[PDB]
C-alpha cells in the first residue's frame, strides 16, 4: 500500500511454504505420534498410537480396542462440526481480524495527519512557499 513514503514489506515465508510445515506436522503426528519431538522417525499404527494416549490419561488400553469403532465415529463427526462452526459463524476468527483492523486503522490516521495545519497557514507545503517569501516561511514550516 504505497501511498506517501509508506512501504509494506513482504513476509519471508510465503503462505505456500507455511502450509508445507503444517502438512509436515500433520503427516508426522498421525504416523508416529510424539517420536518426532524427541529425535528420529518411528512408525506406529494409528490404532495403537491412541492406545498409548489413553494410558496417558489413566484409562487402560483395553477400553480403546473394545470401542475403536465408536471412537472413530465420534472423532469423525467431531471434525464434521468444526467446519460448520466456522464457515457459517459471525466471526470465529475475531482475534485475527482485530490484528488486521488495528494495523490498517493506525496507518490511515497516520496519513490523515498530513492534512492538518498544526498552526500553519495551510496544510499543503508547496503553497506556503508559492505565496510567501523565504525569511518568514521557515517560521510557518517549522
Amino acid at each position: 500500500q504505497k501511498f506517501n513514503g509508506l512501504t509494506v514489506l513482504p513476509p519471508l515465508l510465503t503462505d505456500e511454504m507455511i502450509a508445507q510445515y503444517t502438512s509436515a506436522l500433520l503427516a508426522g503426528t498421525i504416523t508416529s505420534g510424539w517420536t518426532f519431538g524427541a529425535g528420529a522417525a518411528l512408525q506406529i499404527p494409528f490404532a495403537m498410537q491412541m492406545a498409548y494416549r489413553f494410558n496417558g490419561i489413566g484409562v487402560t488400553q483395553n477400553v480403546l480396542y473394545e470401542n475403536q469403532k465408536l471412537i472413530a465415529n465420534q472423532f469423525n463427526s467431531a471434525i464434521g462440526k468444526i467446519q460448520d462452526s466456522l464457515s457459517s459463524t459471525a466471526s470465529a476468527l475475531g482475534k485475527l481480524q482485530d490484528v488486521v483492523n488495528q494495523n490498517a486503522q493506525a496507518l490511515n490516521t497516520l496519513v490523515k495527519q498530513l492534512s492538518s495545519n498544526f498552526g500553519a497557514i495551510s496544510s499543503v507545503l508547496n503553497d506556503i512557499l508559492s505565496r510567501l517569501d523565504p525569511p518568514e516561511a521557515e517560521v510557518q514550516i517549522d
Binding site: 512501504t7 514489506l9 519471508l12 515465508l13 504416523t31 499404527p45
Partner: protein, 162 residues
C-alpha cells in the same frame, strides 16, 4: 488512461484519505488516472568484506522496467544470477527468496528440508535399540545495564538563567 465514470460536473477524484486519483483535463473531458512515481528503499546484499567484495542490490517493490536483473516478488534484484536450485541459506530477501555467495552471488527459493515418506504400515512398528546422550546450551538474557540520568544536568548543564 482511466476507466472511471465522472459525472459531467465533477473535475477530480479522491478515493480514500483525500488523495487525488483521477483528474479530468479541461479540454477533452477525458478522465486521467494519477499514480505516484515509483520509489522504495535500496538494500545492499553483501557476502562480507572478508570473503569477497561483489555486491547485489535490491530495489524495494520497484518494477525492473523502471530502473543479472531478476524480478523477485520483493522487488528488482540486480547482480544476482537466479538459479533453479533450492538451498537453506543466509541472506533473506522476501517472498521465499534468499541469496548467498556460492565466486558469485545467486538467488534461490528456500528449501524447507529433506523429504520423508515414513514407512507407515498398519501392522509394523520401529523400536530403537540404542541411545545417545545429547548436551546442548540455551542462552537467556536476565538483566541489562543500570542507568540513571540527571534531567537538569542534561537539559541545561550548569546555567541558572536556563
Amino acid at each position: 488512461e482511466s476507466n472511471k465514470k465522472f459525472l459531467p460536473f465533477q473535475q477530480f477524484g479522491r478515493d480514500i484519505a483525500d488523495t487525488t486519483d483521477a483528474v479530468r483535463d479541461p479540454q477533452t473531458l477525458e478522465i486521467l488516472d494519477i499514480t505516484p512515481c515509483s520509489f522504495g528503499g535500496v538494500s545492499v546484499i553483501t557476502p562480507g568484506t572478508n570473503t569477497s567484495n561483489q555486491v547485489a542490490v535490491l530495489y524495494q517493490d520497484v518494477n525492473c522496467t523502471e530502473v543479472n536483473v531478476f524480478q523477485t516478488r520483493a522487488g528488482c534484484l540486480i547482480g544476482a544470477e537466479h538459479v533453479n536450485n533450492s538451498y537453506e541459506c543466509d541472506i533473506p530477501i522476501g517472498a521465499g527468496i534468499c541469496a548467498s555467495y556460492q565466486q558469485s552471488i545467486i538467488a534461490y527459493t528456500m528449501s524447507l528440508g529433506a523429504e520423508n515418506s515414513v514407512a507407515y504400515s498398519n501392522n509394523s512398528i520401529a523400536i530403537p535399540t540404542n541411545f545417545t546422550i545429547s548436551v546442548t546450551t540455551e542462552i537467556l538474557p536476565v538483566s541489562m545495564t543500570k542507568t540513571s540520568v540527571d534531567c537538569t544536568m542534561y537539559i541545561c548543564g550548569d546555567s541558572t538563567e536556563c
